Amino acid sequence: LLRILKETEFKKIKVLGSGAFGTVYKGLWIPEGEVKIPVAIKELREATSPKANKEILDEAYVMASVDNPHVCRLLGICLTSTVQLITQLMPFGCLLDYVREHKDNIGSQYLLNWCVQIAKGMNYLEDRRLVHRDLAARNVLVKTPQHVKITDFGLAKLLGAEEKEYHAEGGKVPIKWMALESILHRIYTHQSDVWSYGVTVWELMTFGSKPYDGIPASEISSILEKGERLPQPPICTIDVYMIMVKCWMIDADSRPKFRELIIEFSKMARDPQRYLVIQGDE
């Protein structure tokens, strides 16, 4: 069900970004007996163990099969000396950039619907037994300003039949998005994804602020243990903020579940002005 692509089938037109994971390209895909399809091409550059490659693949089989409006399907994969994930291009780009650059074109309706859409997508993956491990606004993509999609850059994990946890080996990691148990113990679960959902949501409501701004990531585990958390966004009523905060409870199982997050944000989205007060959105 997952398409294995030959290198001849596709070409990288442009660089779109780099990072720990590797590099993203603007690209063009020609399927074999054909149409040109504008695609993104993620080239993973971590020198993988066998353990690591097996894990990426398993994640890839799942992503290939996804059929949900709010998650990007893996269109194909090209394994050589490097893994390349091929995916439909989103020209609008990522949601972090959008809220920074187009703050003024964003009301309460847009924001709570984004919250629902991400929850739905994240719930879909949880039903697929996939720990995403990398939810941030830097990895939610805008199909269109009403419709947003979650993606992966190879870091997600499929949990086996009787597994609740994934224990990571050490790597380059987004400290300020991570749940505390992922930093102290490198443990990743659906509930640690919930934590990072909260942070994602904070970013949206603060129109792209840098979380824990001016506190070095080295100090994050401390301040969390002492009960410090991201502050209440200016536009947020208490009802919304308290939802975000519950995601950052110390006990992972006590946090909300994406199911509850959908139902909750969906109610709010039927009367947005009640729950987010944004200037000029009256």
Binding site: A20, G170, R186, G227
Partner: protein, 48 residues
């Protein structure tokens, strides 16, 4: 109306939920990624 009052709209870096035992835990080695002078400020090395 339950909106936070900040001086001139300015958020503090954090806000405390202490002494609530759900948020208070009742110190690993984090290193930046720097090729000259930070090619990525969101990710860090996490070691024991």
């Amino acid at each position: 109306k339950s909106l936070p009052s900040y001086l001139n709209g300015v958020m503090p870096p954090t806000q405390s939920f202490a002494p609530d035992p759900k948020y208070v835990s009742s110190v690993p080695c984090i290193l930046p990624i720097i090729e000259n002078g930070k090619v990525c400020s969101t990710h860090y090395y996490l070691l024991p």
